[PDB]
Amino acid sequence: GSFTKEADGELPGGVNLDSMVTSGWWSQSFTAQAASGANYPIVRAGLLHVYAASSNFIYQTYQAYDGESFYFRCRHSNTWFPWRRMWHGGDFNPSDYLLKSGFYWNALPGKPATFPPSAHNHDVGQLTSGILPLARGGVGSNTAAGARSTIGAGVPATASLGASGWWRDNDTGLIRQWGQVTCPADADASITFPIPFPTLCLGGYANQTSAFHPGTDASTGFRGATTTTAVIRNGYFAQAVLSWEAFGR
Amino acid sequence: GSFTKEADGELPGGVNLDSMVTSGWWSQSFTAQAASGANYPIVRAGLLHVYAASSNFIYQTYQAYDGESFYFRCRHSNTWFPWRRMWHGGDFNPSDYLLKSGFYWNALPGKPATFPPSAHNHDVGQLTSGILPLARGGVGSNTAAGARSTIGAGVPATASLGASGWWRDNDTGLIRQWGQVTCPADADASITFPIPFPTLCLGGYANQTSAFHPGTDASTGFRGATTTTAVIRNGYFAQAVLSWEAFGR
Amino acid sequence: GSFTKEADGELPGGVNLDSMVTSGWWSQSFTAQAASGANYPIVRAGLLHVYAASSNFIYQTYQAYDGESFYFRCRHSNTWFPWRRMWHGGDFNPSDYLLKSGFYWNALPGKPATFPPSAHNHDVGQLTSGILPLARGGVGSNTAAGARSTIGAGVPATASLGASGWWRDNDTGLIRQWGQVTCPADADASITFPIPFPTLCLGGYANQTSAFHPGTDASTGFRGATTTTAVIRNGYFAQAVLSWEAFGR
Ligand code: NI
Numbered sequence: 001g002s003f004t005k006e007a008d009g010e011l012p013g014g015v016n017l018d019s020m021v022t023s024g025w026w027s028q029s030f031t032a033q034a035a036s037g038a039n040y041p042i043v044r045a046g047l048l049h050v051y052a053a054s055s056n057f058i059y060q061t062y063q064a065y066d067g068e069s070f071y072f073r074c075r076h077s078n079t080w081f082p083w084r085r086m087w088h089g090g091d092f093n094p095s096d097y098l099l100k101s102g103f104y105w106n107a108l109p110g111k112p113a114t115f116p117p118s119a120h121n122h123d124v125g126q127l128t129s130g131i132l133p134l135a136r137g138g139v140g141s142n143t144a145a146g147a148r149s150t151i152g153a154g155v156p157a158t159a160s161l162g163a164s165g166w167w168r169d170n171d172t173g174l175i176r177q178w179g180q181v182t183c184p185a186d187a188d189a190s191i192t193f194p195i196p197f198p199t200l201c202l203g204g205y206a207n208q209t210s211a212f213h214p215g216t217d218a219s220t221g222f223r224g225a226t227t228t229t230a231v232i233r234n235g236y237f238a239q240a241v242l243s244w245e246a247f248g249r
Numbered sequence: 250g251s252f253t254k255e256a257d258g259e260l261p262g263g264v265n266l267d268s269m270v271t272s273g274w275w276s277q278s279f280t281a282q283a284a285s286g287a288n289y290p291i292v293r294a295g296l297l298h299v300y301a302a303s304s305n306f307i308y309q310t311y312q313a314y315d316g317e318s319f320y321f322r323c324r325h326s327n328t329w330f331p332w333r334r335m336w337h338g339g340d341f342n343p344s345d346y347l348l349k350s351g352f353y354w355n356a357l358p359g360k361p362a363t364f365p366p367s368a369h370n371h372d373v374g375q376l377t378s379g380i381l382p383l384a385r386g387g388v389g390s391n392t393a394a395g396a397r398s399t400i401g402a403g404v405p406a407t408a409s410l411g412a413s414g415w416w417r418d419n420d421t422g423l424i425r426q427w428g429q430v431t432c433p434a435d436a437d438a439s440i441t442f443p444i445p446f447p448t449l450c451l452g453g454y455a456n457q458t459s460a461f462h463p464g465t466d467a468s469t470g471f472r473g474a475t476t477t478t479a480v481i482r483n484g485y486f487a488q489a490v491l492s493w494e495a496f497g498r
Numbered sequence: 499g500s501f502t503k504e505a506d507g508e509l510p511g512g513v514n515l516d517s518m519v520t521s522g523w524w525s526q527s528f529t530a531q532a533a534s535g536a537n538y539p540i541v542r543a544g545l546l547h548v549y550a551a552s553s554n555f556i557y558q559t560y561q562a563y564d565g566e567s568f569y570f571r572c573r574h575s576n577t578w579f580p581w582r583r584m585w586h587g588g589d590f591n592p593s594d595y596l597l598k599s600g601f602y603w604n605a606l607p608g609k610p611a612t613f614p615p616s617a618h619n620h621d622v623g624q625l626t627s628g629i630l631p632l633a634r635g636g637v638g639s640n641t642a643a644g645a646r647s648t649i650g651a652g653v654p655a656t657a658s659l660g661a662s663g664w665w666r667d668n669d670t671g672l673i674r675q676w677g678q679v680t681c682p683a684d685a686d687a688s689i690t691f692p693i694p695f696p697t698l699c700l701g702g703y704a705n706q707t708s709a710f711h712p713g714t715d716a717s718t719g720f721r722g723a724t725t726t727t728a729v730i731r732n733g734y735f736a737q738a739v740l741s742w743e744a745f746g747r
Contacts (some may be wrong), residue, residue, distance in 0.1 A: 002254060006521070007550075027552060029555060048553070058255060059545075061312075063557055067580065074314045087321075088584050088585060089336065089585055090580075094585075100596050101594075105607070105608035114613075115363075118362075119363075121625070123625075123628040126370045130373030130634065130635070132634055138387065138634075139388060141635065143632075144632070145650075151388060151397055153402040156651070156652035158670065162650075174416050175701065194449075200412075202412065205456040210721070211719070214733065217464075217715050219467035219484075223458045235717075243702075243703075270631060306527060308545045331588075334586055335584055347601050356734070371620065375617075381640075386628070386630030386631065387622075400652070420654040420655040449661075451663075453739050454705040454741075468717060470716065497659075
């Protein structure tokens with residue numbers, strides 16, 4: 001015979017599609033009747049074609065009535081290969097899926113603005129704001145005086161330690177000064193301090209530097225100090241060199 | 250004729266599928282015979298259908314016997330379009346591939362816990378533990394005394410630089426004090442230091458502040474110091490004001 | 499009838515494929531004639547097959563002449579399901595798309611070398627280079643003397659504050675020393691300073707520690723100092739203990 005414009009028949013229930021082995025075409029009108037059969041490619045009413053090319057090659061196709069898909073298989077040397085299920089547009093759209101050409105860092109969406117960093121070091125120069133406190137090994141200030149205050153440090157004394165000269169505690173302002181003067185016998189001599197006392201001479205004394213004669217007086221006196229001068233008085237009966245110190249601020 | 254339930258024939262070797270141009274259907278039973286032909290869509294035994302719609306349109310389909318796939322093409326105006334190879338479930342599964350809807354930061358697996366950071370700065374306040382050592386510009390301690398120790402600094406001297414007063418080196422404890430006293434002629438006067446020496450008066454001296462008469466004695470003496478008092482002795486034959494200094498700790 | 503090796507006919511323009519409802523096969527030779535019809539699965543010349551299985555099931559297939567694709571649909575209970583468009587190799591290649599198995603951190607290309615970090619803290623020990631300046635709470639140096647210089651600090655005075663002893667300002671080198679000596683009547687006694695003056699004795703004085711007799715002389719003198727010794731002179735007519743101070747550097 002031939003493939004006729006009328007189907008060869010309706011497939012009932014309980015048909016083994018393996019038994020459909022002469023050429024033709026058959027209609028399964030009921031999904032439920034596909035359910036009660038065997039080797040249907042899908043439980044779905046559908047159209048089956050058989051092409052019995054030879055005893056060793058029986059081809060089949062299956063078109064599901066609702067377009068679930070289209071199926072084909074072949075029996076070769078008394079074994080049925082598995083059905084193939086066509087992919088079609090009702091299954092997926094390729095434009096829904098990620099191309100390899102669009103898989104890179106910049107394209108990845110939802111990337112964080114910043115990232116939790118791992119352990120690392122710094123050069124001190126990357127510290128660009130703030131003031132390190134004492135509790136972290138800092139001096140708690142950006143000024144010299146403030147740093148000293150945080151750690152309780154004084155400032156350096158200054159001095160000029162010459163044969164005549166001065167020394168100054170700059171924490172408090174105290175100044176100490178010294179020198180020598182030649183005094184006339186039983187009389188006064190004026191001295192001029194190496195530097196002026198900024199506000200006030202507080203005290204002083206004079207010392208006989210000579211091997212003054214025993215049994216004679218060799219008294220001394222420091223008096224009448226200004227910011228720049230004082231008066232040294234010599235009790236020895238002869239001209240003598242007296243040394244002196246003075247202090248103030 | 251018509252499409253018969255028996256195939257029109259078996260395809261041998263060396264068939265050019267371009268020559269298959271009258272309507273019907275033909276079986277290729279041997280992959281090796283497909284190999285020795287031309288314009289097979291795949292080297293595979295299979296079923297070929299020809300639909301010679303007209304001289305200008307010859308359609309063909311090819312079903313591979315092992316389900317490798319299903320193929321179709323058409324000859325239009327004496328040119329054969331290329332075969333189309335159907336995609337089917339034995340080729341790939343779409344659920345194996347990444348959807349664009351699942352391509353975002355949180356979904357990306359294997360992301361590191363932390364990330365190597367790039368160059369950046371800090372405010373000193375983000376330093377929240379540790380003690381900066383001297384080798385990095387720190388003071389190597391969280392205490393004032395420890396900081397001073399790291400850099401070798403002394404503490405401030407204190408003082409009260411009044412007409413009578415005191416000065417104190419707080420590095421060592423040394424205290425220096427001064428004042429004036431009115432002494433009776435050829436006799437002693439007691440002085441009370443501006444502040445007490447914490448443990449010990451170490452020394453002192455007295456100075457005649459007056460223009461004492463020449464040829465008379467104007468000796469002085471500092472003796473008998475406690476922590477709070479001393480005795481100033483006046484050798485001048487008249488009442489006189491003597492100044493004094495004392496030191497201790 | 500039967501499916502004949504000659505097509506049932508050529509489809510002209512204006513054909514509604516819904517009306518193609520008796521079994522057979524038909525050729526559309528002109529895309530433009532597909533354009534002027536209805537329910538073509540694609541505007542393309544092509545081959546249409548009809549399988550009228552029953553009044554309730556009319557199946558159709560459509561092969562586009564240029565291989566645009568292959569289409570199928572079915573009329574079930576007087577309603578046409580939509581055409582299915584086969585996916586085929588001319589549409590996409592699955593190996594162009596990203597597998598889920600290749601979607602992980604290391605595979606993502608174009609990842610940055612480093613990443614902008616988010617807010618975070620540090621232990622001071624991760625500061626491993628540089629010298630913190632004063633403007634950031636540092637001492638601007640890795641040396642003790644340099645740190646002192648940045649903040650303007652002095653060094654500690656040293657001393658030995660015994661009954662005889664010394665005190666030294668290490669900012670300037672000034673040394674002050676003191677002690678007592680027993681002097682013979684109207685004569686000299688040598689003293690040896692508690693420590694040597696490194697270069698120079700600058701001055702000194704002596705003080706009578708005794709309740710010297712009034713009306714007698716009790717002058718004193720400090721003279722002839724070296725780096726290690728000086729001479730104390732006693733004007734009192736009796737043996738006496740004199741105290742002294744000396745200063746230098
Ligand atoms: Ni950092």
